[PDB]
UniProtKB/Swiss-Prot annotation, chain A:
Protein name from the UniProt record: T-complex protein 1 subunit epsilon
Family: Belongs to the TCP-1 chaperonin family.
Role of this protein: Molecular chaperone; assists the folding of proteins upon ATP hydrolysis. Known to play a role, in vitro, in the folding of actin and tubulin. In yeast may play a role in mitotic spindle formation.
First and last residues shown, out of full length: 126 to 188 of 562
Organism: Saccharomyces cerevisiae (strain ATCC 204508 / S288c)
The organism's place on the tree of life at top rank: Eukaryota
Originating gene: CCT5
Cellular location(s): Cytoplasm
Subunit record text: Heterooligomeric complex of about 850 to 900 kDa that forms two stacked rings, 12 to 16 nm in diameter.
From Swiss-Prot, chain B:
Gene (name only): CCT7
Similarity-based family: Belongs to the TCP-1 chaperonin family.
Domain of life: Eukaryota
Transmembrane segments: none
Subunit text: Heterooligomeric complex of about 850 to 900 kDa that forms two stacked rings, 12 to 16 nm in diameter.
Function: Molecular chaperone; assists the folding of proteins upon ATP hydrolysis. Known to play a role, in vitro, in the folding of actin and tubulin. In yeast may play a role in mitotic spindle formation.
Name of the protein in question: T-complex protein 1 subunit eta
Length: 63, 49
């Protein structure tokens, strides 16, 4: 969030209206989510034996 | 006659403001314009908060 505000401060000094800055971030937010959604794959095809492995993978990251 | 002071009677209780003169009704106009100053930039979809 602060990174968006740091790049917005440079655009305000250039004379850009703040609403035009907010309108650009909303359109760019959906383009990033739709791009990452196509890259990921579905792991639900695996059985319960492999499904436990994916739970151990994301656990060690948050720990 | 009850004292050498003999105070002068004031029509209104102490603390009351004044009026008439020149610019009394103008004071009410500048009060609404100053409040309007804050609501002007909030008008329009590109307005601020």
């Amino acid at each position: 969030a602060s990174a968006l505000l740091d790049q917005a401060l440079e655009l305000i000094q250039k004379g850009i209206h703040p609403i035009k800055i907010a309108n650009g971030f909303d359109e760019a937010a959906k383009l990033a989510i739709s791009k990452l959604e196509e890259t990921c794959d579905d792991i639900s095809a695996s059985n319960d034996e492999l499904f436990r492995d994916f739970l151990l993978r994301a656990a060690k990251t948050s720990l | 006659n009850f004292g050498s002071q003999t105070p002068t009677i004031v029509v209104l209780k102490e603390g009351t403001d004044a009026s008439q003169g020149k610019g009394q009704i103008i004071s009410n106009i500048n009060a609404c314009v100053a409040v309007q100053e804050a609501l002007k930039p909030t008008l329009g979809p590109l307005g601020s908060d």
